[PDB]
């Protein structure tokens, strides 16, 4: 039962290089830059889907 | 001098793209060309022709 992917699911596809290092106020989250848009997301939540 | 060196700084701060004295290998330092029916070791041609 493949469950399909729902629908807002946008589709990143994991290249290596955008998972880098960012500091999101006092640590160094590894983040994620989405690449429809530029936005940064240094930590996993509320992220892009 | 900083003479005999290829690299320098591999690392990654918080917030850049690079730590700004970051050295990149040498495009020449990875490159192999063939060698020719006479010993040769060429470089990889830039081509076309």
Same mark, same amino acid.
């Given at each position: 039962?493949?469950?399909?992917?729902?629908?807002?699911?946008?589709?990143?596809?994991?290249?290596?290089?955008?998972?880098?290092?960012?500091? /999101?106020?006092?640590?160094?989250?590894?983040?994620?830059?989405?690449?429809?848009?530029?936005?940064?997301?240094?930590?996993?939540?509320?992220?892009?889907? | 001098?900083?003479?005999?060196?290829?690299? %320098?700084?591999?690392?990654?701060?918080?917030?850049?793209? %690079?730590?700004?004295? /970051?050295?990149?290998?040498?495009?020449?330092?990875?490159?192999?060309?063939?060698?020719?029916?006479?010993?040769?070791?060429?470089?990889?041609?830039?081509?076309?022709?």
């Amino acid at each position: 039962f493949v469950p399909d992917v729902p629908e807002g699911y946008v589709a990143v596809q994991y290249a290596h290089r955008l998972f880098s290092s960012s500091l /999101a106020n006092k640590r160094n989250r590894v983040t994620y830059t989405h690449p429809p848009t530029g936005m940064a997301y240094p930590s996993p939540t509320g992220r892009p889907h | 001098i900083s003479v005999a060196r290829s690299m %320098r700084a591999i690392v990654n701060h918080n917030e850049v793209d %690079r730590p700004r004295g /970051a050295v990149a290998p040498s495009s020449y330092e990875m490159d192999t060309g063939t060698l020719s029916r006479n010993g040769d070791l060429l470089y990889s041609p830039v081509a076309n022709g």
